Amino acid sequence: RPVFPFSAIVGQEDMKLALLLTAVDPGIGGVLVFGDRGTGKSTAVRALAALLPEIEAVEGCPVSSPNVEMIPDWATVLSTNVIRKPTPVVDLPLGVSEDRVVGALDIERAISKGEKAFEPGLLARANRGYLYIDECNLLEDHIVDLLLDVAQSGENVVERDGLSIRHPARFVLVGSGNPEEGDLRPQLLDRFGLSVEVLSPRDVETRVEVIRRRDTYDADPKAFLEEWRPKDMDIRNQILEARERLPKVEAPNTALYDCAALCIALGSDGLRGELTLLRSARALAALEGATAVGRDHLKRVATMALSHRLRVARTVEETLP
């Protein structure tokens, strides 16, 4: 199944960087995408997922276990053969029920013969992949809260109905902020790692170029990919190498000092803010092959890492000249 390639997407610089950063260090947290209706905010996510190496998993496993030994006890898998498949991208549609999101035990069949009665949901499908929410700000507080928690913990625990069901749920959470329903609960916004704006281009020349590329891709997806995949593979190599470099990238005191100074100068105070800032800067350094995090890495990611946590660019050049 061909997917419009990442490298052929026009503009969306910050969106692309955010996806590369969290591809390198998912510990940065979820990505919040602000923009209007037609920005096609999940295009970049699906493209990134498509340029990443396919994952190995037990064919019949609902949570994509890497091997038979990791298959959850509540799961019933017949096809134990390990295969290669694309990194999954799961859409979280508005109005979805909690049970379809987290999964639920068929209490009826559970009394028949227990645990094996658990019916996995979207979280199971998103394991080892991405979870995209098109209208996050329209989602119910308790659902978002739950998704943020699992995205952070990397595990889904359903301790309801007299059972303790659990399975791996490690994924990059990408929530889309539709135009404007009400700049919702600041309590949740602060739980997202990065925020980016993806504005639709207003000049007809850029829109036409965007239309032209998609139309050409549709004319022959295979041929389009042949043309762009070398660039997508360069992006893949950059991420994979960055991951290998990550643990060795240095974080000198000066970097921590800038991190602390910038956050103090701002409204978005500390730790959560300071740590995300530092983690994002280091991921960037790893991406650019830098030995240590410097003031520039910090300045480049500051807006994406801090903007959404206020009650920034001005404060950045001022605090970190």
UniProtKB/Swiss-Prot annotation:
First and last residue of the signal peptide: none
A Gene Ontology BP annotation from the UniProt entry: photosynthesis
Domain of life: Bacteria
CDD domains (UniProt xref): AAA
Keyword set includes Nucleotide-binding: yes
Pathway(s) per entry: Porphyrin-containing compound metabolism; bacteriochlorophyll biosynthesis
Enzyme class: ligase
Keyword entries, A-Z: ATP-binding, Bacteriochlorophyll biosynthesis, Chlorophyll biosynthesis, Ligase, Nucleotide-binding, Photosynthesis
Family under the similarity heading: Belongs to the Mg-chelatase subunits D/I family.
Protein name (record): Magnesium-chelatase 38 kDa subunit
Annotated organism of origin: Rhodobacter capsulatus (strain ATCC BAA-309 / NBRC 16581 / SB1003)
